[PDB]
Amino acid sequence: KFKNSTYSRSSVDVLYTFANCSGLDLIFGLNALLRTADLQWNSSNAQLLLDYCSSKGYNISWELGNEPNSFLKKADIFINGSQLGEDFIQLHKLLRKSTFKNAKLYGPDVGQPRRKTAKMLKSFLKAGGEVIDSVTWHHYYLNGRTATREDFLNPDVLDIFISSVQKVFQVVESTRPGKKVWLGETSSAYGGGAPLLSDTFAAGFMWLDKLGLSARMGIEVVMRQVFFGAGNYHLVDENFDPLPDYWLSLLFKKLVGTKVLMASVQGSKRRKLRVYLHCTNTDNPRYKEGDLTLYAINLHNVTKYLRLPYPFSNKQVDKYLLRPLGPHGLLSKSVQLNGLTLKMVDDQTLPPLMEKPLRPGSSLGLPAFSYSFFVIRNAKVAACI
Amino acid sequence: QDVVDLDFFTQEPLHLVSPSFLSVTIDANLATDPRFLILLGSPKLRTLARGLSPAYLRFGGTKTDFLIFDPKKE
Ligand SMILES: *[C@@H]1[C@H](O)[C@@H](O)[C@H](O[C@H]2O[C@H](CO)[C@@H](O)[C@H](O)[C@H]2NC(C)=O)[C@@H](C(=O)O)[C@H]1O
Ligand SMILES: *[C@@H]1O[C@H](CO[C@@H]2O[C@@H](C)[C@@H](O)[C@@H](O)[C@@H]2O)[C@@H](O)[C@H](O)[C@H]1NC(C)=O
Ligand SMILES: *[C@@H]1O[C@H](CO)[C@@H](O)[C@H](O)[C@H]1NC(C)=O
Ligand SMILES: *[C@@H]1O[C@H](CO)[C@@H](O)[C@H](O)[C@H]1NC(C)=O
Ligand SMILES: *[C@@H]1O[C@H](CO)[C@@H](O)[C@H](O)[C@H]1NC(C)=O
Ligand SMILES: [Cl-]
């Protein structure tokens, strides 16, 4: 099915310019199926690219291969984790001899940890773990061909991610204890996403829950498939218009800080009301050192009312509640923040993301099938410096 | 009455995520689109991308392992 294609210096420049002009840090995946006689990685093509990027003074990080667990299916070539580890050592040596000798190297971009994938990751980290800066793996909840609306709202589907994360950390703790663990490619559903679902307000339950659990469980970076492209899990559609998950992503970035804390709901039933707690993002000009950001998902079919614990019960709280714009409900491609539709001001201008201050001492209302952020002002949490 | 009490742990950070915690991909596949230059040159798309800075941008996908650099191609 998959055939070789070439790309140009032009294509590299297009990609680099887009990252550089957008304030993003580019990670470039190198082709791992370029193989010598005895199935060693043939680095000669990568050398041409490193030389070109070096000549243009491009600051780029590297990967080698995508989902090497499925090379036998995709290309009728089997590469074991030991050999891939050796291939990464060969790439690390090329980077060290290049103009950016301190460039970062991530891998191996394995799929989620089924038996055979866990084995490949373990043998890869034993062999090649010393030269990677982070361990990358991938996760999807569903097959986009068969995913249902009910699946997108099902806490039993959301919870499966917890076991994937625990299984990856079991492999990494056994081989390279303390190595950073990244999600290198992740979405609701694979095969380009679930039609009429992966591009809707309903996609946000999975995305916000994945971010919450990733942060809580020790994942340092989550790479969303995809910013833009062929697949309705895109954040930005074919018209360059943002979908609900773009707005959720932007709100997350504005409100949620780097220091991860913990929230939980008193009582046995913890499935359908999902809660996460971080320090507030210090870059947010409205808030101050010590403030908290709570985010919550309500998969119940009724409004829930959250009560904050002492000593936060009487604090000024800012609500940032996301609900779909009708008439298509959770299958809407439009979202409102505190009852205002989120839309570009123009092609150059994002809108303000306007808070709704709540009455101090009021319980936090979370409607059925919704998600919200809540900033606790003057929380004065010492851990948040 | 649909009221729920939260417990918070606030003693110390349990983890520290990257400032780039929420990152994004562009699929390797997109470089096989004849309009790759027009698409990534879009001012509107770049405005939305800047909105998510700081972030990593992973250029990668199934096609990562089917793409060959040709320094002579135009
Ligand atoms: C992870 C892969 O790296 C990624 O490339 C996949 O998405 C692309 O490829 C699949 C088939 O392998 C297509 O259905 C998608 O439309 C592609 N997406 C884009 C954005 O071009 C991805 C996936 O299955 O969706 C993961 O396998
Ligand atoms: C609503 O959901 C019910 C199961 O959820 C429980 O009951 C509701 C009223 C809330 O109290 C929720 O917090 C509980 O966990 C179903 O039994 C019922 O069929 C659902 N109604 C519809 C219309 O789907
Ligand atoms: C891709 O290229 C390599 C070497 O350049 C070649 O050996 C291989 O057969 C090609 N694969 C496909 C699927 O066309
Ligand atoms: C690696 O690939 C290049 C170009 O495809 C080829 O000419 C070179 O001789 C290869 N090296 C080995 C050791 O197979
Ligand atoms: C891994 O692959 C190579 C062939 O590329 C082989 O020589 C080696 O024995 C394999 N390792 C294991 C553990 O089988
Ligand atoms: Cl293996």
Numbering used by the authors:
A (entry chain A): 159 to 543
B (entry chain B): 36 to 109
Task: Provide the publication's sentences verbatim.
Heparanase (HPSE) is a mammalian endo-β-D-glucuronidase (hereafter, endo-β-glucuronidase) that plays a key role in HS polysaccharide degradation. Humans express two distinct and unrelated β-glucuronidases: endo-β-glucuronidase HPSE falls under the GH79 family of the sequence-based Carbohydrate Active enZymes (CAZy) classification, while exo-β-glucuronidase GUSB is a CAZy GH2 family enzyme involved in lysosomal mucopolysaccharide breakdown. Enzymatic attack by glycosidases upon the electrophilic epoxide “warhead” of cyclophellitol-derived molecules leads to alkylation of a catalytically essential nucleophile residue, resulting in covalent and irreversible inhibition. Herein, we present HS-configured pseudodisaccharides, featuring a cyclitol epoxide designed to bind selectively to the HPSE active site and react with its essential catalytic nucleophile residue.
